């Protein structure tokens, strides 16, 4: 909590642990003992509850509307199972992430650049981790509102079932009794901490994304300025200081580009994981939102299951996007100084770069897919497409 | 010397698309210019019009629109080719003086290399135009020709004493009445007319793109030869003035090669866009047809005869685009195998400014909506399943 | 109306400005009050009568062909309203794009080139303007004649239904008397404003790409003798001018490229919503034309509304892929000149420019998909492929 | 068997020629004519096999289900005997292949990197050969056990079907003890072998693209020094050693593209049928798992056909993706070393280096696709789409 890229999240672990994303690595090591042991009750507690939600999807697969739903519900809180227990087996490759911008380079001319793009990385990376705490926020209030607005109504004959947030069996009689409101509270519970897990890991992906975005944007800001440097022959200190540039323009790309592949490398699997769930998620919701017959309950919540799941795609590909744009942009940015006026060394600098930029910076699916608004798009068209077959067919 | 595509020339005459086509320096003349659109304007009057007036009159049913279709289509096809060949004559003539100036110039070098080249290339074209023209120039006799025959034979056996009323080809509908035998005679021996123009039309126009091709793939193997003769002159270890100029004359072959590959675009853009559209049916309502009436009768044997003429119609577009792409993508492999390490750094630069125009994409696109490769045949053969599928549906 | 770029687009903003679209920038401030009101009152009777269509699709619903005919319709009538909308609220962008050539480059030895090429867009952009207008004025011209070849009759029995060139709720009887001719004056007003809006906004983002075309081809033109300019060692003088017409071809190249980014700007979301809106009427005109069967007047008029969104689509993508074209293009005009005899400073030049020129510039309508014929070709394949999965489904 | 690529491969060679895989070319002339009928031997044997089950599906052919099942059988089994045939024809391009990297170059500086990454490159070869072995020996005992587990029951009423490994009419009676044994055992042989086979010629393939890969690897990281060795203004001995490392850095690299193209030849057409094979079999396994309803051998025998089509289709794809990364990976460390450092003629060589390695390595099923694992999710998104399909129309 005293290096780069790791006070700069700093708020971000500090959520990711205080929800139980395990993360021993950031804090004295007294409070290593009791947090952990917090850490995995929450996690049994999230199992536990998953469990008996699994128990009633059992004996509600008579019917295909409630087998349907109860599946919907399945995935949706499989998603921050699958990422708290992903977290922990791969901790390695996260904390080398965080430790990647522990050591940086500097140059006396490009350290007022450098401090400004810092200190707007950190805003962003704030403002989208508020953003997104509202957002999972919005969502749990309206969860809770709903489950009451609506009318707690089985069809068989008409049978009074539970009036509770989340479908699930429960040994005790969890109708009127105290177990109803111990059961009210444990589901709040279960429903805030699940989504903050998954969110919380989801942010601190796009803060890594975020923060590369913001050190393109640097180097192609100081790139402008480095040609007038380099163009006015040159005597031996000048060519030196043009020297030191490149060198320290080359080498923070570089870097860049390594915190890149770090960041591929810990979220691969995670991303490819999310779209197998997302995929199965959204074919459900399709065939649910054929059955929509008017503004009731159910559109509002085949609605609100369609924005959540499309909400969580169109973040990863929005922050995906934005990287592959300034990555390519970074060749427009060297192409628009006065490289005609520069030296020989900086135009085949700047020819090399170009070369480079030719390709630009992305995240893969495990080598499956890349993370841009046309995966999103391709998402949307595929989801649409099904809906309108399935209207066809029936 | 002029047997640069010697019988494409044969065939382009016999159309009168061209009149001195045997010359080095084949001209443009408006006389040309109006004999072929009005031999364009016989085909359209003789078997587009009245077909179409019988596919959007007395068609009935599906398999009747089906039947119709079939030859219809490549009909509308030719007619095309024919406007669009003799509205671009221009362009086609200039590719082909340039192709033979290049001929030219290949056949006065004295390296058995490019002399073996040369022999291959013109077997090649004269073999294919051959083969081509032969298979396309049968399947339009058989379909257009067969009542003769048939009339011809009943004469010589059964003499005068059986009786074989004669019917004109394909169905059509015409505005005046054909009972009489004199008008039935003039429109058979109009529509014969009009199917002669049409096969040499589509034979001649698909020779004389894959022949094209075969000659740019011929002057980028030359080029090939040069770029190895520029190695091996930067290992042998000259001065840096003699290895320049031998990369200027090989950087204005692959101009010279790149302007070929442009003018071929240019000329034949809409002529594979509309290829491709049309053959997108094409293979389909032949394959329908084929499945509706297999046997052993004379249309089981005429669309047998059509569909893989159909098919390797739409497969010479593809792998020909095909080769041109692969061919000049080749160059920079080739650039890359020299050993340029050799070399001073001036012409290291020259080199990759080759390279990095030797890289770029390069082939004939389909109206310029995409490049044409032969990942292309897979594309429209899925298509024409796709229709194919739908029409037995249809039928159940 | 003085600078460049205004003046060249001036009679295409007079349009705009006669059928509504805003546009309080270039006339004297006098004007600026009356024509204000004018444009307000358009909108009103467009929303108006917009409104008096929504309010017949609401008692039309109870038949799925009427229904289906009713939303194509208001589809097709949400475009123009849609962009007359948007242009005021990003009146600030438009203004921008029209004032970025005002200040433009200048070299003597490419100036003859530069008018030529000017000359030729203006030239181009008018042809383009009156063809867009005499096809507006064709569509026009051809819904009032099938409006009153067909019978107006409404099948339930039949109903007599009034003769208007829209469906439509009125109040009044407008049916026989006075109010039917007043009810189809206004359709007739409505149908030109609504026409008119419309294409004027498209037909100003397909002019900016011609200038950015034939600027385009300005630049290739002069980078033939460009290098015969520097092959001929050289005297301090001959470097100078290979210096300037060098910086000259850069820059004018940048500016292209800032026209071409401010232009996408200006119209990304402009051509998300038309695209959104499209793919609805499209699926809409597939059910439709599933139904046609002979040459009568339905007929005539789904062939009409397929034509009319196809074109639409296809102007826009005709524009975008030009664009692509002439950018590509840049590199084969750059290696077919002498490239060879140049001197050191030109050969880095011309290598740089092909490095630039790997990529084509675009449009894309909020970075989920570009504007070129392959744009169009995936609707149409994908407007076809319904209509297939139509008939073969039923 | 004394020289570099079959040498290395030597055991995967023993392997194909022990299971009949002709080969008649690393022996000594003794075994020349003796293995020869042994192989002739086992193809009569395929075929004879082959031929019987054909015939088989003459006779069940009235029915659709035993029809699809029978189809999905005879192009597993069509596999192999299309790759037994395919190398015999094309012998020659496979004798030219395994004797590219007889004679490779060296250099003093580079010999420590080049003989551990070919060590690793062999314990690649060995582990992948050693793992589809494994894989193989593991399908046929799931086979075996499979066929004994599950009941032999006919529906026409129940009629007994003999109890044997696969469907086939016999002249045997197949019932009594002798027939019912000479039967397992024939169909065990014939499934080993033919599974021995396909599978030994795609590991040849896959070792051929790992011997690729890991020179690929041994070329970065020689990349990284060679820089440095020339980063230092030379004296004429360090411009010679410079220079005949840059020679053995291109020289390789020519080397390993010329192995990739002699393997893109052969097995571009080879793979060219395999998925030719692979796409029918993949669709009539998706109507298969449409009747799919938790019953444990039908749904065991679908899975298991699905997992080894989608495993041969992903193993040739895992391959040709790790080429391609390779390549791009080449360009990546030539631009991540210290050339700004480097001399004109270095940095020159990086600058063609890079531009020669835009265009990635890869393998073509003779130029109708690329063997990648994009390749592999569009067979996976067209199955699982068709699939999905399919069961909304039942
Ligand atoms: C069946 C066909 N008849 C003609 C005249 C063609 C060009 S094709």
Redesign the interface.
Known sequence: KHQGLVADLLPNIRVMQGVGHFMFNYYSEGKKFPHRIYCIVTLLLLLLQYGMMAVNLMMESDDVDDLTANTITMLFFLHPIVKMIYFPVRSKIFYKTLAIWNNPNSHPLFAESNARFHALAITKMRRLLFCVAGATIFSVISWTGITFIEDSVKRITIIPIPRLMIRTFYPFNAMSGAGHVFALIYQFYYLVISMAVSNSLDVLFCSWLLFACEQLQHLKAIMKPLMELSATGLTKKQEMLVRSAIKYWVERHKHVVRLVTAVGDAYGVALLLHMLTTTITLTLLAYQATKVNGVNVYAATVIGYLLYTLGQVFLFCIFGNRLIEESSSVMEAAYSCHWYDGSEEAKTFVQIVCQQCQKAMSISGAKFFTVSLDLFASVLGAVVTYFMVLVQLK | ARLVLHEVRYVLMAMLYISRGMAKQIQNSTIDLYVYWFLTFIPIASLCVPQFTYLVVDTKSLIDFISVLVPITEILLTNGKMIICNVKRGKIINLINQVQVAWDECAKSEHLEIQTLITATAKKTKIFVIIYTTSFLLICVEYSSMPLFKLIYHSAVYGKQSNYTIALPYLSRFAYSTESTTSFAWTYFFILLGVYLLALTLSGFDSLFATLVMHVKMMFKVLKFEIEQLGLDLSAGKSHVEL?AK??QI?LKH?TN?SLI?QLEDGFSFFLMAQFLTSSILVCVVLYELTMVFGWNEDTFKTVTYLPGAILQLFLFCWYA?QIT?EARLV??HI??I????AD??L??????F???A??PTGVTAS???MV???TF?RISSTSY?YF??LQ??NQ
């Open positions: 320049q990369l200027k950087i101009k790149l442009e095909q692969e920079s492999d890359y195998n050993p340029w390490y050799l750094p001036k290291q630069k020259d080199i990759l400014t390279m990095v125009k890289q770029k310029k909506f995409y490769t032969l990942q897979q796709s599928t739908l549906t249809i």
